[PDB]
Symmetry: D2
C-alpha cells in the first residue's frame, strides 16, 4: 500500500510501498478515507519541537508514517472485536495508552508512560490503511463524512481539552492566538458551542481573520496592523483576558500575551513553535496567573468533541482536499503560514 | 497609640504615635494581643517584590502600619455589628474586599480591584489597636490563644489555599520548598492534615529541616549538602513530584525544582524572593505541567484554616515572641534567614 | 407609594400605600420599572411550599410586598455607595445575605442563616420603589431594557445554577420538565448557550412546547398526549437522561422522570409544587444517581446569567405585560397554568 | 480446587471442587491468600438487594463463587502480561469493565454496561485461586500482607469514593451510619486521613462504637441508648451534618438521618439494606440537600485507597481470620450484626 513516511529529518516525506497490516485480537484495520494535515507534522519533518529532538529526546524511531487526524471505514477486525462491523465509517482516536501505568489508571491515557500515538511513534493516516490497536478508540460516524471528521481526532480533541482547561463562563473573555489556522478555527467553534464566554480571535493574516470570523469569533484582531495589547485591553474594558489559548507559543506570542492576562487569568499553552517562557515570578504570584500545558486529549475528551460534532454543533473547516502524494505540499503550506482552516488528504 | 510604621522605603520601621481608630457601622476595633512577623515585611521594608515597587507599581501609600497576621480582643464595635461583644478573642482576616467588583462577586475577595489589605495598603497589626472594616472578617478563638492564632491569618490561609491548588491525593507526592520557615511549617502541617499525599520538605539549614520533620514531613532534604533532584527522583521512583509549593521562587529555586515535576505536575508559586521563571515552552505543553500563582486567601480559605486550627488539627509553630518595638529586629532575622517557624510580636 | 402586599394568607394581594424607603450607608433606592411574576408567588399567596408554611415554618412576617424579579432605575443612593448614580438602569439580585454566617463566607449568600430575600421576607418589586441593602447586588443594564431583564433575577439565576449543577457536556442529554414556563424557557436557552448537550423539553400544552422549541430545545415532548418515557428512552437510545431539571416536582412528575435517569444521572429539583420524592434506595446506590436541590443563586450565579444576557446570548421570553394593580390576575394565570414564558408588571 | 459458591438463593454457600483457571493473554491467575467477607454477600445469599433480585433483575447467573475482597500471589500470567512476575503479592480490583462503553470511556469503569465483577457475576475470592481478566487491575503489595490488604478492594475503595463524594473540608462535619462495621471502620479511617473534617460515628452496639473509636472517630453516638438527632444537633451546634455516609439505608436510618442534614448537606447512600427513600421534595429544594448514590469505585479510586494504605496512612481493621469453609458462618455473623471491623478468610 501507499504511505507517506518520515525517513530522515530535514527531508521531505517519502512515498513508500509497505505491506497492509493484518489485524489480530482487538485490533482493527481501517481503510483511510481522510487524513488531516496538522502543523505538528511541520515540526516532525524538521525533526524537532523547540529544543526537543523527536529521535534523540522523544524516542521516535524512524521510519514512521505520519498523520494523526484519522477517519475511514473498517476493513477487517480482529477476533476479539465486538460492536463493530466491516464497512462502518469511523473516526480514530490516535492518542492511545497501554492501561497499566499511573496515567492510564486515572483516565489521562494520552500521557501514558508507553504511548501508542498513531502518526507519531506508530504508523499513522498518511497511508491507504492504518492498524488501530484497539476498537475502543473508534467512534462511528453518521452525520459526518470521513473528510469532515478526520480533523476532529487532533485539532478537535486538542482544542476541546484546552477550552475545558480555560475554565470559561459567561463573564469571562477568551483570546485565541493563531485563531485562523487548523486548531484556531476549531478552538473558536468549540468555545462558542460549549460556553457563553466572549471569544476574541488573534492572527496576523487578513485571510486568517476571515477564517476566525467564519468560525464565530465575537471579535478579531490583526496583530500585524493593530496593537493586540491595546485592543484586548479595550474589549475587556481594562480587565484583561481571563484566558488565552496560545496556538503558537513562539518568542513573539510569549513576549506579548502573557502580559494581557486578567487576575486569575489562565494561559493555556498548546502551540509548539518552540520558545522559552520568561516571566517575572512575582507577576505570577501577585496576579494568581496560571501557565497551563495542554496536550491532545483523553478518551473522555475524544468522546466529548466527537459527540459535539456528530450532533452538528461544530464542524471542522476543511478548506482543501488533496491527494496522499501531496502530503509534502500540504505541510509546506502550514510551514509557510499559507493555509487557513484545515487541509485533508484522501488516498 | 504605639505603632511601627513603614514611613520611608529602605529604612527601618519607625515607632510612631497615632490616633486610636473609632469604629462605626459594621466596623470593629481590635486590641492587638499578637502580630505575626511575615517575610513579606522584609520585601515591604525594602520597598519591592521582585521588580515591582510597592509605591509606584503596587500603589502603596506611605506611611502605613505593617502587620498582617492579626489576633486580639474586641475593644469597641460599630452600631451595626452583630454577633460579637467587647472582650471577645478573635483572629482577623486582613485580605478584605469591597464587594462590588468582579472578584468579590465570585468569592475571591483577596483579589478585589479596590483591596483593603490590613498591614499592606491599610494599617495593620504592628500597633496597640487595629480597625477592622467589617465584623465578617473575624473568627472567634476558643482553643488557641492570640499568639498561637495570629500566624493563621497569613501563613495559614496562604498555604491552605496553596495546598488546595496543589490538587493532592494519596498517590501524589508534594514537595515544599522553604519547608522550615513560617509558611513552610504551616504548609506541611496542612498538607498532612487535609490529604494523604507523601510530603517532601526542602530547606537549607539542619534545624529548618528538623522543624519541617516535626511539622510532619515524610522526607526532608537539605539542598545545600545533597542533590535534591536525585533524592526527589529516588523517592518518587523516577516519576517526579506531582506538586511543588515553592515558598521562595528565587533564581536558585526556579533553576532546580521546575525540572523535577511529574507529568501534569503543578508548580504552586507563593514565595516572593524575586526572579524570573524561565522554562522551555514545549516542555510545559508536552508534559502538561502548570505554573500556578497563589496569593493569600479568600473568606472560604480563611474559614477552612481557622476551623482546622480551632479543631486542633494544625497549629502555628511559634518559636519566639517579642515586643512591638522590636519589629525591625524580627524582620532582620527573616531577612538574614535566622529564624525557624514563626515570630510573634506583643 | 403603591404596593401590592401579602397581607393575609389565602387572600389576594392587597393594594396598599406605604412610605417610600430612605437609603443610608451603602443602601440604594430603586424606582421599579419592571417586576416579573414568578410561580413562587402562587405558593406564597397560598401560604406554603408543599407542607412548609411560609409563616410558622419558613418564618415569613406579614405584611410583605412580593416581587423577586427586579429591574429599574436608581432613585437615591446612600452616602457610602460607590460606582452608581441616580438614573442608572439596573437589575437587582434579591437573594441577599449578611456576610458573617458560614454560608455567606463560602460564597453561598442565598443560603444565609439570616436571609434578606427581597419579595419574600423583605419588601419586593411589586411597588413603585424598592430598597436594596447593598449596591453590590446591582447590575448595570446596557443591552436589555428593564422589562426584558427583570426575569433574569429569579428565573434566570435559578436555572443558571440548576444548569450548572446538571454537570452537562456534549455527550449528555438534559430533560427539562415544565419547559414552556418562565423557568423552563430560561433553562433551555441557558443550557443551549453554555453547553453542547442534547436538550429535551417536556410540558403539557402544545403552545408551551412551541415556546420550548423556540427557546432552543432539540426535542419536545407533550406528556399529556404521548408517553415521555418511550420518547426519552428512544432519543437517548435506551441510555436514559444524564440530567433532568424538574421545574415542577409534583406527584405527577416525580412518579415518572426519576425512573428515566441514566447511570450517574442527576435529578435537579427546582419546582416547588409540593410532593414527596419516593424512590427505592438500592436503585440510587446501584445506579449512582443523584437527587439535587437547587435554590435561586449566589452572586457568582447572578453575575453569570446577567453577563450572558447582556452579551445577548440569552433573553427572557416576556409574552405579556400589565399594571402593578393587576398582580393578582398575573398570579392567577400561573396558578391556572394559563401562561407561557414570563409575565411582567410595570 | 476448593470454592464456596452460591448455588441457590436462600441457601448456604456450597463447597465445591472446580477446575483451576488457565490464564491466557492479559489474564492473571492468583493464588488466594486472603478473602474478606462483605455484608453484600449476606444480600447475595438471600438473592436480593432490597426489591432487586440478583438473578431476575440484575442478571446474575448461578452458580458463582462469591468473594469480592481479593488479595494473593501471582501463580501464572498470560502471554500478554507485562510488569508482573510469578510470586508477586497483589491486591485485585474486582470492579472491572470492558473498555468500549460510555462509562468505561469516561473513567467510570465500575459502571460498565457489561461489567465483570469478580465475586458477583464472575467467580470471586472464596476459592483457592481466582482468574483476573487483566493485569491492569492488580496492585503490588509491599507494606501490607494479603490479609491486611484484601478488605481494601471493596470496603476500602467503596468508602474512599463515598468520602470523596461527601466533599469534605475542615469546616464540615461527617456522620457515618453503621460506623462499627466493615465499611464503617474504613470510612472513618479514610475521612480522618484525607480531610480535616469532624468525624461522627453512629451505630447501635457498644462493641461497634468501640470499633468506631479505634478507627479514629472524633465523636461516637449509640443510637440505641442516645437520641441520635439531638446529639448530632448538639455536636454541630444546631447546624446539622454537612455530610452523611449511610452504610445501611434501611427503613430505620432513612427515617432519621436525612432530617439532620445541614443546608447543602450531602446524603451519600452506600448501604444496601433495602428500603424506599421517602422525603418531602420542598425540603430538598429549599435546603439544597443532596441524595447521592455511590457504588464501589473506579481505577482512580482503587489507586487512591491502595496508595493510602500502602503508605501506612490507613489499615483495614481485621478482627478475625477464618478458614474458607467457614464462609457461611462469617456471613451469618454479618447478617446477625455480631461482627465488628472485617472478617477475612484464608484458603
Ligand atoms: N499540544 C497539542 O496537543 C497540539 C496538537 C496539535 C497541534 N499543536 C500545535 O499547535 C500549533 C498550531 O497548529 P495548527 O495545526 O493549527 O497550524 P496552523 O498553521 O494551521 O495555524 C497557525 C496559525 O498561526 C498564525 N500565526 C503565525 N504567527 C502568529 C503570530 N505571531 N501571532 C498570531 N498568530 C500567528 C498563522 O497565521 C496561522 O493561522 C503547532 O505548533 C502545532 O504543532 C499542538
Ligand atoms: N503569595 C502570598 O500570599 C504570600 C503570603 C505570605 C508570605 N509570602 C512570601 O513567601 C516567602 C516566604 O515567607 P516566610 O514567611 O515563610 O519566610 P521565612 O523566613 O520563614 O523563609 C522561608 C524559608 O526559606 C528557606 N530557604 C532560603 N533559601 C532556600 C533555598 N535555596 N532552598 C530551600 N529553602 C530555602 C529559608 O531557610 C526559610 O526557612 C516570602 O517571599 C514571603 O514574602 C507570600
Ligand atoms: N428553587 C427555586 O429557586 C425556584 C425559583 C423560582 C421558581 N421556582 C418554582 O419553580 C416552579 C415553576 O415556576 P415557573 O415560574 O416557571 O412557573 P410556570 O407557571 O411558568 O409553570 C411551569 C410549567 O410547568 C408546566 N407543567 C405543569 N404540569 C406539568 C406536568 N405534569 N408535566 C410537565 N410540565 C408541566 C406548566 O404547563 C408550565 O409551562 C414553581 O413551583 C416555582 O415556585 C423555584
Ligand atoms: N455501594 C457499595 O459499593 C457497597 C459496597 C460494599 C458493601 N455495601 C453495603 O454496605 C452495607 C454495610 O456493609 P458492611 O460490610 O460494612 O457490613 P457490616 O455488618 O460489617 O456493618 C453494618 C453495621 O451496621 C450497624 N447497624 C445496624 N443497624 C443500624 C442502625 N439502625 N443504625 C446504625 N447502625 C446500624 C451494625 O451494628 C454494623 O456495625 C451493606 O448493605 C453492604 O451490602 C455497599
Ligand atoms: Zn499507560
Ligand atoms: Zn472587590
Ligand atoms: Zn449569612
Ligand atoms: Zn464498559
Amino acid at each position: 500500500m501507499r504511505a507517506m513516511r518520515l525517513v530522515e529529518i530535514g527531508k521531505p516525506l517519502k512515498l513508500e510501498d509497505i505491506p497492509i497490516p493484518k489485524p489480530k485480537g482487538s485490533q482493527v484495520l481501517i481503510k483511510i478515507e481522510a487524513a488531516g494535515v496538522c502543523h505538528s507534522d511541520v515540526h516532525m519533518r524538521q525533526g524537532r519541537f523547540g529544543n526537543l529532538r523527536i529521535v534523540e529526546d522523544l524516542g521516535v524511531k524512524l521510519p514512521v508514517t505520519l498523520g494523526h487526524e484519522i477517519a475511514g471505514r473498517i476493513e477487517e477486525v480482529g477476533d476479539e472485536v465486538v460492536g463493530y462491523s466491516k464497512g462502518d465509517l469511523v473516526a480514530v482516536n490516535p492518542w492511545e495508552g497501554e492501561g497499566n501505568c499511573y496515567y492510564c489508571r486515572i483516565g489521562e491515557e494520552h500521557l501514558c508512560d508507553s504511548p501508542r500515538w498513531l502518526g507519531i511513534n506508530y504508523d499513522g493516516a498518511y497511508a491507504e490503511y492504518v492498524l488501530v490497536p484497539h476498537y475502543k478508540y473508534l467512534y462511528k460516524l453518521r452525520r459526518l463524512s470521513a473528510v469532515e471528521a478526520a480533523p476532529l481526532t487532533c485539532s478537535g480533541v486538542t482544542t476541546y481539552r484546552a477550552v475545558r482547561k480555560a475554565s470559561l463562563d459567561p463573564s469571562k473573555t477568551l483570546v485565541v492566538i493563531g485563531a485562523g489556522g487548523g486548531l484556531g478555527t476549531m478552538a473558536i467553534q468549540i468555545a462558542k458551542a460549549v460556553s457563553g464566554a466572549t471569544i476574541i480571535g488573534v492572527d496576523v493574516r487578513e485571510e486568517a481573520l476571515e477564517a476566525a470570523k467564519r468560525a464565530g469569533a465575537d471579535y478579531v484582531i490583526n496583530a500585524s496592523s493593530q496593537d493586540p495589547v491595546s485592543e484586548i485591553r479595550r474589549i475587556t474594558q481594562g480587565k484583561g483576558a481571563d484566558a488565552v489559548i496560545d496556538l503558537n507559543n513562539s518568542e513573539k506570542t510569549l513576549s506579548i500575551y502573557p502580559y494581557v492576562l486578567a487576575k486569575q487569568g489562565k494561559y493555556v499553552m498548546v502551540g509548539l513553535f518552540g520558545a522559552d517562557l520568561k516571566y517575572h515570578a512575582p507577576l505570577i504570584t501577585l496576579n494568581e496567573v496560571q501557565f497551563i500545558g495542554s496536550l491532545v486529549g483523553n478518551q473522555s475528551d475524544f468522546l466529548g468533541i466527537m459527540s459535539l460534532a456528530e450532533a452538528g454543533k461544530v464542524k471542522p473547516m476543511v478548506t482543501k482536499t488533496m491527494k496522499l502524494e501531496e502530503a509534502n505540499e500540504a505541510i509546506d503550506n502550514l510551514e509557510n503560514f499559507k493555509a487557513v482552516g484545515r487541509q485533508v488528504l484522501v488516498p
